[PDB]
Design a protein around this nucleic acid. Sequence first.
RNA 1: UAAUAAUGGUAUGUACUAUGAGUAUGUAUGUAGGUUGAAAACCCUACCCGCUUAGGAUUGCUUAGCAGUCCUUCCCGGCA
Lengths: 48, 145, 49, 129, 129, 98
Amino acid sequence: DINFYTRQVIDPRLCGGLAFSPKLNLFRYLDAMSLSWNRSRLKISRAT
Amino acid sequence: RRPVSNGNFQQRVKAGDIVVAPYTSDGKITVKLVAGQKDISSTPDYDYRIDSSLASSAGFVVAGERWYYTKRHFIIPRYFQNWRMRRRKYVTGWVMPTFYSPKEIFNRLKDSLVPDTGLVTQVWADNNTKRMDFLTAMAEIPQTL
Amino acid sequence: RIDSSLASSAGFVVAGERWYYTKRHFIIPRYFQNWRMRRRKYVTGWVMP
Amino acid sequence: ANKPMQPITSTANKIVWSDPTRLSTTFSASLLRQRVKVGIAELNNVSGQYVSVYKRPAPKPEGCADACVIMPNENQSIRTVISGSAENLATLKAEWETHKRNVDTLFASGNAGLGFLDPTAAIVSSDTT
Amino acid sequence: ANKPMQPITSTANKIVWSDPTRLSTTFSASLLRQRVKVGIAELNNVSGQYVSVYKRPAPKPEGCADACVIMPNENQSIRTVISGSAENLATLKAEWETHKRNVDTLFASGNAGLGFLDPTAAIVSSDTT
Amino acid sequence: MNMYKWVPESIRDSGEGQPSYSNNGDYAPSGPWVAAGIHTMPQSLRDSMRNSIMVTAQARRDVIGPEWGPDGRFTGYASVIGTPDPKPADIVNKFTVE
RNA sequence: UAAUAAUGGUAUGUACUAUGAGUAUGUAUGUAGGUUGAAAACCCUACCCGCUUAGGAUUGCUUAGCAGUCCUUCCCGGCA
């Protein structure tokens, strides 16, 4: 007769990925043109 | 039991963090062994007739001591003896079966403990479906930004 | 071959499983069995930029 | 089958329908006809208004209030008015479904419902090559 | 085979479409969202108002589709305003085709465009039996 | 390790579709229907929905995101062969200007 | 408890206009009180709701993984 309970991690070093990793599809996304708001910042700084 | 505390549990919960930790129960493993008879040899024998009424009256009509099987014939197994047996003189001893201790049993079990890759992949896919739903819903936000 | 569910919703008129591309005729997503698909065997490995 | 809706107030201009089971939902279709002269020829102008209002209670917050109480009901309204001359309903019918197909891409298929537009949408006019 | 159009005025609120072939026809979409607490609980109300106008000159005197006989133009404007809670958008969508058919029954298939009205016309609601 | 991966940008419309012709003369989801020829479906709309499937499949690629549909409706599919390869953690190097 | 007001607001309906939701208007300003006046009741009290401040809750427990909250304070807003 054996009766006990255990809980184990998903060892995220090995497993834990295999997902979408929402970094991508957003880092390759507008991060450049949104950064390009340097144009507007320069505009406001000129009149500042 | 091997419990692990996460420190300021409630504080981290309010901060907005999900927490996991390995855990073990105070389980028990038992091994019980029951001895049995071990026949080694036999030789003497004898034939007994005595009585053959061990069985019940299934398939017979009961009328007092009469076991009616047909409308005109019956038998009384108290005296209806037609089965002959044999009885021998067996030689037997007490044999004690043996088994591994629960210590090494649990050691082997915990060594064999391995997560289910198929279940892991299926659950990851199940989560990723709704993850994609929300990502597709939210995709327009940085455009407004 | 398989089908082409979740293709699109605009223009098509949805009647339960039925998707009416016209007033009278309709098509069904899991019955749209006219597509030829390639699935290939891939060996992959992570690389560090 | 969807539950039939029956009128409550009939008039030569306005007919207001409501569901017998729950009369809070309404569908008021008003009409407004005028005389318009443009091309030295009087034309029949109809300003057909249609207002469909449905009421569905709350977004139903989880737990807590899910015993015997309902947060006050909200209002869902869709208003449509159709103008133009009555001598050319045939083209008015054609553009209406075109308007129906046009609105669907933004609303039914696109995310305009949640409040976000889509400049890369694909809409077409009533006319055809 | 339907000719598409392309945006004219781009704004965080309004997008103006228009046919390059025929600049008269246009379709624009503006929407305003409001931060509301109706039953002391927050709600996501988005009001998407849609206009589709076509200047189609079609008096076209009887059997006179013959020659260079130009007619003055007349207006055909279609105004739609959809406002409701974004959280209930899924069922708000479901109510929307009910508005489609309801208008279609009384007007597109009915005879409300001429300015007439039929109280006995089949009017149905969103919910089902 | 090996990884089953979906392969978009290599599809074709084989024309095996069977649109259904509703005998009810409306968008009714009930009543009788007749299988019709695929010639009725417009080429432009067919191409549009095909490209929609293309972009959805390309987005759902090398993700192991969704699985095979219970009804058989596939998605961007990635079946693992054996143990999946560990993914190195995204490292960070930081410098502060004094 | 409270008056002078600047009562530039908001929401919901009306008539005109509308390749516009613009114009003007009625109504009400989360829930009830005190109060002249400018009765669109200015303002204070009390009760709810949502912000903000920085502190906490058994912080660990669990033969399952919890839990997406709770209380106070700062706290500004739900007619000016």
